[PDB]
Amino acid sequence: KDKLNPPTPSIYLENKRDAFFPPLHQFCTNPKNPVTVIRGLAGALKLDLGLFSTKTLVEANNEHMVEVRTQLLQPADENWDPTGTKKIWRCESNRSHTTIAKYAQYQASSFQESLREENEKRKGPFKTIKFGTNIDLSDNKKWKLQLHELTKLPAFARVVSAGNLLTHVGHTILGMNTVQLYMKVPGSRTPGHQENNNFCSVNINIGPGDCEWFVVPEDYWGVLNDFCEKNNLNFLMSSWWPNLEDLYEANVPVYRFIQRPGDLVWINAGTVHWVQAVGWCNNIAWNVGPLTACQYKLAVERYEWNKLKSVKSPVPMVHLSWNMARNIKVSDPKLFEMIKYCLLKILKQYQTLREALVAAGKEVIWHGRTNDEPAHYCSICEVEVFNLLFVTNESNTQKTYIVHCHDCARKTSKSLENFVVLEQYKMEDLIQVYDQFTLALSLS
Ligand SMILES: [Mn+2]
C-alpha cells in the first residue's frame, strides 16, 4: 500500500510570525502526527547556526569529551552482515572517547579525503567510520552564547519553559533538560530507539550537510519489539537498524524524509526513529514534555515497562507526579484524572508498607528533605524510591544515607535488622496535597 509509505507532516516557516503562530504548537503535539518537520526554522528566527559550527566549538572548549561510535559505512537504507551475504537487524557500533579538538581534525580530514577520491576518477567489504555523539552542553559557564541563542525559539520547543514537564522535575536530567551535541561524517548512524520514558524530542541540524530520517508511529512499537526478540536483540539496550523489507511485509508504515540545515524535527511521544548523516554536519537535541494526557500516559507506561525489563528510568515519574499536584493547575479533564489516579496508587501502597513496618515493631525515623534534593533511586536495583528510604545502620551512622528500596533491603537483611527506615514526607502533608489537587476551569 501507498499507506505504508505515508507523506511527512511538514510545515514551512518564512518569518517570526509563522514561528510564533499558535496552531504550529498544536500541530506538533497532536498525537495523529508521529513526527513534524518544521522547515526553514533557523532562517525564520535568524538563529545563528554558526555558534554550533565545529570551528567555533574547538575555539570554545577544545578538550571537551566526545563519545565515539565506530561503525561501518553502509549503502543507502540497508544494514548487512559483515560478510555481505544477508541483510540483518544487528548493527556494529563500538564505543570509545575522544575530545572536540580531536574529532574535529578527523571530521575535516575526512572531507578533504573524499575531495581527492572524487578527483581520482576511475555486498561489501565496507569502510569504517567514526561518529561523535552525546556531547554534553549543560554547563552555562562553558556554553553561554550557545545556550542563549536557543532561547530565541518559541516557548513550546525551548529547553526550559513553564509548560514543559521536564522543567518541573526540580533537577537536571542530563541530555533531557540539557542540550546534547552530535558531530558527524557521512554514514554516521543513530540506531533505532524510543526516547527516554517516551518524552518528545527536538533536533536541529546545524549543517552544512543533510540527515536522512526514518520514523514509525508509537502504536507499532510492539512489532519492532517482536522483531528484536526474534533476532536475539534487546529492543531497549541493543543497537539495531531495521530491515525496511521486513517492515513492509509486516504492514508497518514508515515515514522517510530529509532534514536540511536549519530544519527542526519534532519527534512526538513514543515515536520510534533512527537516523543517518548524508553529508558532513552537526546536530543539537534535547527532550520536551508537553502537558497532555497522551504524553503523561505514555511516560507512565514506559516507566512501568522499564521495571519489568530491569532498566533505569531517567525520569522519576513518582516525584514528578507529586510536583505537578503541588504546583501546576491542570484544566484538562483526561490528564487530571490520570494524575489523580496515579497519586492515589502511590499513597495507598505507601500507607500499606508503613503500616506493615509499624505492626512489626520497626521504627520509622523522621528524616525530612532539603529543597532541590533529587528523587532517590535504589543503589542496587535502581528503581525510584519514594518517601520511605531503607539505609544501613552503618550508612546512617556515617551520614552517607545510601538508599535501598524495601525489597532489596529485605533480601539482604531478612527482618531489616541491618537497616533504619527514614521518612522524608509526613503522611498528613501528602494527604493534603492530594485532597487539594482539583480540576481547574479553562474555557480553551
Ligand atoms: Mn532520538
Ligand SMILES: [Zn+2]
Ligand atoms: Zn532495589
